[PDB]
């Protein structure tokens, strides 16, 4: 790849610069290069990887939703026929989104997950696997849609099982996993009751463990707890 000639440390340095410049496509490309060096990622480096791709795919998802809405409006009664362009451009954006998701899934499969033995790393990568299958599921309409949804579920569930055994209920990775899996249940799996139950139980179990935390850890955990509360408020 195009980053093969760049030092690992330089790729990481440049990813941090790209983040400061809000150049998330560049950030993602630097981080992909760093992963492809073959060494395990540190905590900081896992965060860089995730931030980069979250921001790239986030932008693509927002664009896809704009275009999908326009396309849906075009298919209503009384809408004038404007030709294939809206579908074509929605497809273009969709294909680019799918490409990014496939790139991330590829990094996780070759070989981040299999080398991840500590709970913090393994849960984090399995959560990411769930997230990128979820993004594929958002745009899926064909023969494989059920298998894509099941791939997301399986990844999230493996992450949940490890997190419950190995991490305290306030751990930010455990909380973030639960937040996202709850959204999977609500938005993808047509399971709003499961979504609500998971968010409520996660919040309550975290609340009960806050007493163990330093001020700084408390700030980190409570930030994500508020996201759980925000979703619960949206859904109830």
């Amino acid at each position: 790849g195009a980053m093969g000639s760049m030092e690992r440390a330089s790729l990481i340095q440049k990813a941090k610069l790209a983040e400061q410049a809000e150049r998330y496509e560049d950030m993602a490309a630097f981080m992909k290069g760093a992963v492809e060096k073959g060494e395990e990622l540190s905590c900081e480096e896992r965060n860089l990887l995730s931030v980069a791709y979250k921001n790239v795919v986030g932008g693509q998802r927002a664009a896809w939703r704009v275009l999908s809405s326009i396309e849906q409006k075009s298919n209503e009664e009384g809408s004038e026929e404007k030709g294939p362009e809206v579908r074509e451009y929605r497809e273009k954006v969709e294909t680019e989104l799918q490409g990014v998701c496939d790139t991330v899934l590829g990094l996780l499969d070759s070989h981040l997950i299999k080398e991840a033995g500590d709970a913090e790393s393994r849960v984090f990568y399995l959560k990411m696997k769930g997230d990128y299958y979820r993004y594929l599921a958002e745009v899926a309409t064909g023969d494989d849609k059920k298998r894509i949804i099941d791939s997301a579920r399986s990844a999230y569930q493996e992450a949940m099982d490890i997190s419950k055994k190995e991490m305290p209920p306030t751990n930010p990775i455990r909380l973030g996993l639960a937040l996202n899996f709850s959204v999977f249940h609500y938005e993808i799996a047509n399971s709003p009751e499961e979504a609500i139950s998971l968010a409520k139980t996660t919040f309550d179990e975290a609340m009960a463990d806050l007493h163990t935390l330093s001020e700084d850890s408390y700030k980190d955990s409570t930030l994500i707890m508020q996201l759980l509360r925000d979703n619960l408020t949206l859904w109830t």
Binding site: D131, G176, L179, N180, V183, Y186, E187, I224, L227, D230, N231, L234, W235
Partner: peptide, 5 residues
């Protein structure tokens, strides 16, 4: 749209 991290 709901919050994710």
């Amino acid at each position: 749209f709901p919050a994710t991290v």
